[PDB]
């Protein structure tokens, strides 16, 4: 089949429970990509349909700040998802290396993430799993694009119609509405953007407990603050944008298109 004929495989870039990502070259085109490789015989039909779902949602999306899926090739024993190669690693890794970002750098970062998220929302896709582990730097060069990845938990929504679709996401990034079994939709991604923006500016999250019982109570209550001294020199407008994203009521919470016009993003 077409992958073995058209591509050469090189070094491992990343690994999951059920996948390996290797650099590949589309030999006749002289173009590099990242191949996410799944051993199909080791997976259930349920795991297969989750993969088909991910590929289907990725193909809806064409944006400079979203990892593009170029091809999907099912060979005997292995399935290949051919994505953009990105070489700058996870935003999570960048934040640990730098400790935290300047307001200028954090504004530039969250602007690109909001552009990606708005594009998803306009295409009726809710990601549900926004986190720095899931945002990739296109390269290691300064100013390299941040790109949304891992649509394995994403859902398709019908206009603005909401429901409790189910319990999905990453504990520290979960929205109050998801934890309360309230109807949800696009706003869950803006809550995660808030958690991300908080982390960018000081290098730790607004909600953390070893004890998940306490973590979920803390998220549902909107129980975060801005401790001294690190937050004392942070502009009020940066705090205001975080507060508008970490609004417990998902109706009142800032939208992606609204956040893109907030003066902390717009005035640059």
């Amino acid at each position: 089949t077409r992958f073995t004929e058209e591509y050469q495989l090189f070094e491992e870039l990343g690994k999951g429970a059920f996948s390996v990502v290797r650099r590949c070259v589309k030999v006749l085109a002289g173009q590099e990509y990242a191949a996410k490789i799944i051993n199909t015989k080791k997976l259930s039909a349920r795991d297969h349909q989750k993969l088909e779902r991910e590929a289907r949602i990725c193909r809806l999306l064409k944006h400079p700040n979203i990892v593009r899926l170029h091809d999907s090739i099912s060979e005997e024993g292995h399935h290949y998802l051919i994505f953009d190669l990105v070489t700058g690693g996870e935003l999570f890794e960048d934040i640990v290396a730098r400790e935290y970002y300047s307001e200028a750098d954090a504004s530039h970062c969250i602007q690109q993430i909001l552009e990606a998220v708005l594009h998803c929302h306009q295409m009726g896709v809710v990601h549900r799993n926004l986190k720095p582990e899931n945002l990739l730097l296109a390269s290691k060069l300064k100013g390299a694009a941040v790109k949304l990845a891992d649509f394995g938990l994403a859902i398709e929504v019908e206009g603005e119609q909401q429901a409790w679709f189910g319990f999905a996401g990453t504990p520290g990034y979960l929205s109050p509405e998801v934890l309360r079994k309230d109807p949800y939709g696009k706003p869950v991604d803006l809550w995660a953007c808030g958690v991300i923006l908080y982390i960018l500016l000081v290098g730790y999250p607004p909600f953390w407990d070893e004890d998940q019982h306490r973590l979920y109570k803390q998220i549902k209550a909107g129980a975060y603050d801005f401790p001294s001294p690190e937050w004392d020199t942070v502009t009020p407008e940066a705090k205001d944008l975080i507060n508008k994203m970490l609004t417990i009521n998902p109706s009142k919470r800032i939208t992606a298109a609204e956040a893109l016009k907030h003066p902390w993003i717009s005035h640059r």
């Binding site: 999570f92 999905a168 953390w208």
Partner: peptide, 14 residues
Amino acid sequence: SHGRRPLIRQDRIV
């Protein structure tokens, strides 16, 4: 820890 938390990787989904 006085408001400062660790940044800990969260790979595991619910």
